[PDB]
Amino acid sequence: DTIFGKIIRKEIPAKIIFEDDRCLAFHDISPQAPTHFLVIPKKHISQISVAEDDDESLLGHLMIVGKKCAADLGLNKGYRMVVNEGSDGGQSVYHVHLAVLGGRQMHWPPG
Amino acid sequence: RPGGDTIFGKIIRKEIPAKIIFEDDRCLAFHDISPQAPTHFLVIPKKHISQISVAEDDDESLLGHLMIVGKKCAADLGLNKGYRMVVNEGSDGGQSVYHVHLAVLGGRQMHWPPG
Numbered sequence A: 001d002t003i004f005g006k007i008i009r010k011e012i013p014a015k016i017i018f019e020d021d022r023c024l025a026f027h028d029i030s031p032q033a034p035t036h037f038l039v040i041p042k043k044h045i046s047q048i049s050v051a052e053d054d055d056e057s058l059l060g061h062l063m064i065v066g067k068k069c070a071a072d073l074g075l076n077k078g079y080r081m082v083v084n085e086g087s088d089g090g091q092s093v094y095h096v097h098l099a100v101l102g103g104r105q106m107h108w109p110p111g
Numbered sequence B: 001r002p003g004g005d006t007i008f009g010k011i012i013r014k015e016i017p018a019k020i021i022f023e024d025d026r027c028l029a030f031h032d033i034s035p036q037a038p039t040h041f042l043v044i045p046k047k048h049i050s051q052i053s054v055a056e057d058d059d060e061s062l063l064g065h066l067m068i069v070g071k072k073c074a075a076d077l078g079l080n081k082g083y084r085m086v087v088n089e090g091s092d093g094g095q096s097v098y099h100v101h102l103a104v105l106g107g108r109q110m111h112w113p114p115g
């Protein structure tokens, strides 16, 4: 279990943007841009490297939900979606998460 | 034309060369021409979608397929210490090629914030 499991279970608070039967979107507690939120599956997939073929449409659902949340939050000028894997990827929580950052110019390289 | 007529559509149809990692009926993975990490590749749909903000609901499986292929290619390329997947959207996201692309970067420590 991780802190994101606690958030899904409503045991600790987060600023929830969207929820359905299979995912949750909420603002990141350590924002790196004026808008910075996460979309996470309710299924506990620890990291993208272990996602199974059967998870394909769920992973795409995270991206469609992230797209819709970004539009609802006014990110008309663009944004960046990020999935971190493992140590080199800087993955901070072992529950897969799609980060969405916008409201400023994002730079290159992306870390 | 299948794939559209950006540079990425030209790569899909073999009109412009690329260093291809994986190809199926839905997507293509190839190495980036301007790598920002020791390994840096792209996964693109063969269906032309200009940018993620106009993807349709019925594109869900295709987008998830880009991520599955990205993680499978990262494993085949030996990125066992990890990697970062990046989808740039529009001006603030840093997008110039208006054909959806998922970038995978690894082979070094990635930093925070991600740009």
Ligand SMILES: Nc1ncnc2c1ncn2[C@@H]1O[C@H](COP(=O)(O)OP(=O)(O)OP(=O)(O)OP(=O)(O)OC[C@H]2O[C@@H](n3cnc4c(N)ncnc43)[C@H](O)[C@@H]2O)[C@@H](O)[C@H]1O
Pocket (backbone or CB within 6 Å): B007, B016, B018, B031, B032, B033, B034, B035, B042, B094, B095, B096, B097, B098, B101
């Ligand atoms: N054949 C290939 N094979 C493998 N990988 C490839 C590839 N081609 C691209 N890639 C890679 O695909 C990934 C995603 O590509 P992108 O990040 O979308 O675009 P890019 O190819 O990196 O364009 P770049 O930043 O260099 O061009 P710019 O807009 O400054 O400027 C481009 C032109 O647009 C003009 N322009 C840009 N912004 C403008 C503006 N606001 N107004 C007027 N003109 C503008 C500029 O003057 C300039 O002439 C990248 O990592 C890239 O390396």
